[model samples]
Target chain A: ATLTAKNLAKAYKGRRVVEDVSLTVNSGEIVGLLGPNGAGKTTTFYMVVGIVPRDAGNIIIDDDDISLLPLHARARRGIGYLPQEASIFRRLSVYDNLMAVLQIRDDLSAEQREDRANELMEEFHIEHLRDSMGQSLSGGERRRVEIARALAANPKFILLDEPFAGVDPISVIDIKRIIEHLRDSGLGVLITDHNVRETLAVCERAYIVSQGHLIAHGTPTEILQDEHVKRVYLG
Target chain B: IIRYLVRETLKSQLAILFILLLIFFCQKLVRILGAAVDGDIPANLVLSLLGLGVPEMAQLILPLSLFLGLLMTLGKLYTESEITVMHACGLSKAVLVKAAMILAVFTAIVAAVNVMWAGPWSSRHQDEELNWRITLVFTVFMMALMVVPLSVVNPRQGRVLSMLPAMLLYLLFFLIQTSLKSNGGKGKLDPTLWMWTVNLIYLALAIVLNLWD
Candidate 1:
């Protein structure tokens, strides 16, 4: 299934935050949305994930145009999101946090949810913190827990915002490995981050935005080597 | 499951019991100290009065303890976000309410036993023990008058100040009893007038309060 956003535009308080932005992620693809601070990368991601209402555009997921669907409705159609900040309930245990998101699972029994939750914890190397409250975890642990929580629902597509922020170098490598593993599992993933170098290294394709405009979209090597991209961001 | 329930219930009940004891002891101490300072009652008599007062005090404490237990248990569940977890686990409010009701039924049974069986028995025993202290009868009559109005109009049942008639009947009974006892003879007087007045007033108040409800 291909998730595509067409001519997406969003504005706030008469100021355009995401204007004429469009992107697509086919199944088994990892796309990195790279931009400087205030480049509207978060807004664009929100527009794509149906978090904020698009001023004008269409989001087609699996050939179904879901531009009009509410956030949870779009979520029910298998769009998982890990917001920039830790979005899990801070007071709840990691297992409970996962259970809260994996709602109304008829196919997965209670035992299965519990088993899979434990499996994800082990896979993410946070199994030691299984019973730990969300707030008690360190920054890296929180990101891992958030990712695990997002995957708890087993969605076909995922939108992760700054999954590497404040994470240790080893954890960043682990996260990239997890992203690759997820991509190989035939899940479409859109990861937005300000770490241009790391994003370039991990993502197969990268989209660079400046001032709410898509300046470049191609292989990370091409974008990094581009004189205009370097002058605008690196320089 | 039964053991868990018993442990939780007993923990909550013990907390209530401690609070009741603290309040009762403090109130008794204050009243006794005030009476002794005024020289209206001797310190020894104060101790004796408190000993006789324990049963009546226990009756009041039982219901209050149960109410506090309900509040504390439910409040703890709410504060810990256990209610949210329970809800997410598909436990409906009705199921939780039923569980609480089971505890409540036990509490009610305990209250009934205290009120009907233990309370009257304790009162009879106290009366027998204090038979020589006839002067304390006035204190009992006054306390009964206050309690009767409070019981009849217990704001918990939404009666408010509507218990005036019951209060008056209690007053009348106290007056007649005091007059007859003081005279050292059983003076006969018709209580029918007082009964009719009390009944009519209570009926009127019941109608008014019911209409408001």
Candidate 2:
């Protein structure tokens, strides 16, 4: 059983933003969603995460169809989304930010949630910033804090959009390593980024999309060297 | 906690000061115009009127200042997105409301003090002074306008200045009345104290209405 999008088609006011986009991400797989700006990459992510209304699509997680679920419902089903812009509670401490997400999960006990949050913060090297307010942190620190927050729920699948944007080079490598570790731990990972070279290095499989359509799907090295991929992106 | 309290208190006091200033200027204008109509009313008579007016204005200013302060401070918190973080952290709106209510209660107490004590004292002194100055109409009228500058300086302390012209008039009237005891001066009752006492009760009622559920 794996995560799958079948014949997904989404239109916005008489124009198609995503049309007939189908893909699959199995456990332990890191799939990179590559596309230029305004190529419907974020829209596709929004649909998958149940943030946007999908005109036509079927989403299955571990063979369970969840196409009709709302955003919170998808969240409850272990779909963690780190949106393009990390929206954190600015007045809350870094520890509280992570703890707040844990509080949303009804299945975890208070003690369990606290332990998990602390452990994740320590793992992400944000334990030192536990007492710091969200606004007081640097951009790179904020990104790391949000990533720690995403991990707080112990999600089975992680969807990250432009997670490296504005992140320091050191933290970018740190986030890449974390994503890889999560993928190796059997969590299905879907990451979208405009940074082709770094994304290619991190993701084993790649899906190159343009104008809301999947242009090519293959290994990262193959997709990177493809004549059409080169012509459309590099050109 | 001390810093937060000080910041909130200073902001609230500043709002009160502005309200007091507005009331003082508006009341002073009305008093001057009113005295002008009375065919050369004495300056001391005008001063007495202003003294009586200040306590009434204070009753209105204190609560409004506190309410506006609460709204401004909390609105800033909401606009800055700090409230969102607090909400996400499980801080309920009820908690915020409670904090605001605490400030409201403090303002209500101050209002009580103004009405119960300050209001009546200023009124009685102003009436006494007005009675004394009624004979020197032109001199008293000039003194009445002086209340405007006093009200402008520091509204809290200006309540005392409001009574100065009236107190002088009352003393003058008393001196004249002592010399002419058979001329019905003894029968004249000073209702200024009674009027302010009743007004203070009304002020208490107003404060209650302003802060009640």
Candidate 3:
């Protein structure tokens, strides 16, 4: 499956938040969305996932135009979104959080759901935290649980917003390894992160957006070498 | 998700209901005990009057708990941004609303039962049972007030030591009430045989909850 945003444009009041942005993420590839804080990286992802309505753009999922779909329809349409906040049900247990996703999406039997939840928990190394409540988890554990819950739906594509924020180096490595696994497992993953080196290592292709505009798109090495990328992103 | 959401709501609501019921029951006991001391109601009927209040109180607790439980659960979801995670997980807001409405209908049915059946039945028949429903409520909470602090202090033996004396004293009360009541309602104290029956029921209950918790 392919997700393509054609000349996406959005604005708030009078100021343009995202302007004429377009990018594509293919199956079995990790695409890094890199930008400064106000460069509208989250806004672009939100638009592509249909959370934020685009003023002038079209989102195509494998030839099906899904620009007019509602936000809730995005996940069912094979576009899973992990919001920038790394949100999880704090009052619910770790198992409950993951189980809620599989149950709500209406795709798994009881035994299969339990098996899949345990499987992901094992992979994320959070199997011990299954009965532990979400509020009791450490920052690293919370990040892993969030990623696992997002992938619980088995969606064809996933958009993770800011996967490397507010976590330690060990957690970053763990997340990068999971992203590598997702790509190898034939899932299209779009990630936004501050760790340029880690992102470069994990993602084959990259898109550097600045001020809601596409500044560059190429291999990570080429992106790192570009003078414009050096000026805006690296500095 | 709907099943789990409803289960979560039920567990929370039941907790709130029990707390509210116990609190109000204790308040009523305080007032009732005062009245009993003043000879407003005879010793035997004092327990019965308090008993009459239980059904009304329990039913009253139902709606209050329902409102609080639903509000608190959904409030946590939205304020903590759990709703956002659910939305991203392919759960629809309409389905959420639908689930809530279904639960609300069931709540309405229970509320209707309170209004139509429990309300009239309790008022008319309360004079008949003369049971220890109120007695147990008051007894448990009274012990609870003391036990909460004691448990904080010593944790284990404090609990056992505290319940021991209280249980012995109550057992004596029940025993005397039974012996005197068999002689056919004598003097300003000793209740009737039915009251003794009520005391025995509560004696067993008090023993169990104290040890259980």
Candidate 4:
């Protein structure tokens, strides 16, 4: 199932911020929402995930119109999100973060949730960090656990916010590999970030936003070639 | 999910509660020491009075401790973005509030136990023990009043002059009680008008200081 956000518009205290933005994350592909600082990419992502209410927009996930649903309400309908700064709980142990998400599975018994959390820890190669507090993990490690947490909710589509922000080079490569692994394993993902090189590396298709407008939508290399894209980043 | 959330939050709250409990107990100890210094009670009986005073006072402290515990524990989670993580994992505000409400009820139960049973039960003892307790409490309270008077009178240089009034009042009470004890009579003041005046003064002080606290 695909996630479609159309004509998204929002304002705070009667000033337009996100105006007429639209994007799609298709089944079995990774999509990138690319924009520079203050370009409203984060706000756009929040709207799609139902964090901020869209003044005028329709968000349809897998043909279910979830425009009016609240955040967790929409999440219950198979949408998962990671906020850019705090994608995980700093005080909770890694295993507990995943266990907290497994509540979506009523079929899973208490032991099953515990086992599944440990399984995700192993899957993310974070078994050693499982007992560690979320704040203690490095940027890359935190994102991996966060993505692992997103996976735990069994969402059909996962929305990732700045997965590689402030990440070390080695971890960036590792994150890209994990994202590629998810795409190859047939998970639909929508990633928003200003990490141009890595965002272009993982996403086949991209949307560029500047000052709350969708300026361009095409292949990452195409966005890389656009003169306007150059000015948006350089300026 | 609510079970896991409440369980985890309660652990943090209880840790905070223990720390608050110690602080409350320490403040009580300071008063007990002041009582021993100002009153004629022996060390052995002072010890006895201290134990009874604990639960009686703890009934009052318990409510403050639990209230602060909830605020700090929940505030910690909010500040650390742990609550944000819970929201992202599809936990709603209602769910979080529900878990905290459970903790609130639990706090109330502990507070009720101290207030209803532990508190009064500790006070209802021997008449002689009760008088000793009263003397210890008043002496300690008079000693504490020295600082307030100092703050008001000179604020700095007149500290000794301000404390003189409290010291004289406490000494007079001590002398009167000792004379009564030596006379082999019950230690309570016998002159009805004078006794009523003393009671009213303490009551007024209690009202004023409690408002200040």
Q: Judged by DockQ, which candidate is best?
A: 3
Number of the top-ranking candidate, with lDDT as the measure: 3
The digit string of per-residue lDDT tens for model 1 on A123-207 reads 8887677789766788888777777766666677888888887888887888788878877798988888777667777788987
lDDT, candidate 4, A1-235, per-residue tens: 7888889998877777888898877778888877777888778877887666578988997578888877766776767777677546656787776776686576769899998887777766778777888677887787777767767776678888777766677767877886788778888888887667667777888878888788898976677788987887735
- Pairs with steric clashes in candidate 1: none
Off by over 4 Å in 2: A105-112, B1-213
lDDT of 4 by residue, B45-116 (tens): 666655645664464444334434444444555544444446666555556445545655665565556545
Ranking by DockQ: 3, 4, 2, 1
Of 1 and 4, the candidate ranking higher by DockQ = 4
Tens digits of per-residue lDDT for model 1, B118-195: 646676657661221222222222232223113322111332334354346445554664444444332252323343
lDDT of 4 at A199: 70
Number of the top-ranking candidate, with TM-score as the measure:
4
lDDT, residue A158, model 1? 82
Candidate 1: stretches off by over 4 Å: A99-103, B1-213
Task: Write candidate 2's Cα lDDT for A61-137 as tens digits.
Answer: 85688998755556656676775665665566777767666775668688988888877877778777789876778
Error of 1 at A203 (Å): 0.9
Q: Between candidates 2 and 3, which one is better according to TM-score? A: 3
Candidate 3 C-alpha lDDT tens digits along B1-213: 536566677777778887887686686678776777766766557757556666656644564465456555555555455555577666655565455555655565665555456656675667472233333333332332222212222211222234354446545554664355556443444455465465556556544644432
Interface root mean square deviation per prediction: 9.0, 7.6, 2.0, 2.8
Q: Regarding TM-score, does 2 or 4 come out ahead?
A: 4
- Docking quality category of candidate 2 according to DockQ thresholds: incorrect
